[PDB]
Amino acid sequence: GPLGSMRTMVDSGQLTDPESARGKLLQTAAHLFRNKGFERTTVRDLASAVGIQSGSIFHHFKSKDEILRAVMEETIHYNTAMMRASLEEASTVRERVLALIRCELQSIMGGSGEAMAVEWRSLSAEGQAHVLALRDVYEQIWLQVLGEAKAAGYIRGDVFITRRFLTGALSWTTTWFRAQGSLTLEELAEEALLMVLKS
Amino acid sequence: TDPESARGKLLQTAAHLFRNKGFERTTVRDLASAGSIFHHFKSKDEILRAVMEETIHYNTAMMRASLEEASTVRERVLALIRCELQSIMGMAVLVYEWRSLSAEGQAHVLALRDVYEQIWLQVLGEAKAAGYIRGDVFITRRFLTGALSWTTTWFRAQGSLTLEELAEEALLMVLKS
């Protein structure tokens, strides 16, 4: 089950327990990097906010750049794994597309927010390398599922162009969704499905 | 307004000044040195107003012209898509200086903006009534708005994809069989 696939991520050391020592650092660092800037935040600022000695951070990260990398990778890994979980809950081709639309909207409207909005211009290149690899996996899932829909005859246009259109359509929702007031995210997801798929 | 006329030249230089520098720190001097500028406009606000208004005027007129050439509901949606993509890939001063306008300037720009979106809603409305759109008209427009504006991030990297072909792909997604 999808819960089990998430658990496997936990028992791979890929996802971090929020109430664990490492989780405390990541959670706080994300807050600090977000609403105070990465360049302004120091390692000792992180330790102070958490409530530990500045020397005990070396146990977990051994560098500030690696804290930023861990904050970004954790958030992407979680999001991607949650898309996979939602896909396992889907039963048809339409529900699989809807699963991806709904997941992306949830992140767009808040997820993780702090650890998602965060400083690419201050992350290293080797750190940029693995993050880009994670982004490729994320987009791979979109392309595969959209590819399934096209094979089933729900998409007449190009799969890659379709994803690019849908990327823009969904991200632009930050500018108008709250103003609707009564529209739920689930209703929003169904509308996006109506747009991009047939029948 | 003819872009080769004295006015057209002025709006372009002013729009360029307003973008990178900003309205506040744009001076009378650099507006007058790029001074026929005082013979065309009565105030600095009036210049900023004309910069935004004529852009919307131009975009709106181009859409109306394309709609009259279209003779099917599918050709009419495509005409709007092609026109908006053209403006997009070709308007930024507004969403980067909105405050500096007078009450009358703001009022008129919003009204122009309403007529623009009215055209979209009416054409999309036709498509839905004809059975080409299955979703809500207003939400379809908002989806299409983001889909088309996001094309600035990837279109220039495609190389072999024409903007016409891009519009056709947009049409394929937004309209039913």
Residue numbers in the entry:
A (entry chain A): -4 to 113, 117 to 197
B (entry chain B): 11 to 44, 50 to 105, 111 to 197
Text from the published report:
A novel enteric T cell superantigen, I2, and its full-length gene product pfiT, are encoded by a microbial gene associated with Crohn's disease (CD). Crystal structure of pfiT at high resolution revealed that pfiT belongs to the bacterial transcription factor family of tetracycline repressor (TetR). We show that pfiT specifically and directly interacts with class II MHC HLA-DR, and to a lesser extent HLA-DP or HLA-DQ, and show that pfiT shares an overlapping binding site on HLA-DR1 with other superantigens. We show that pfiT can stimulate the activation of both mouse splenocytes and human peripheral blood mononuclear cells (PBMCs).
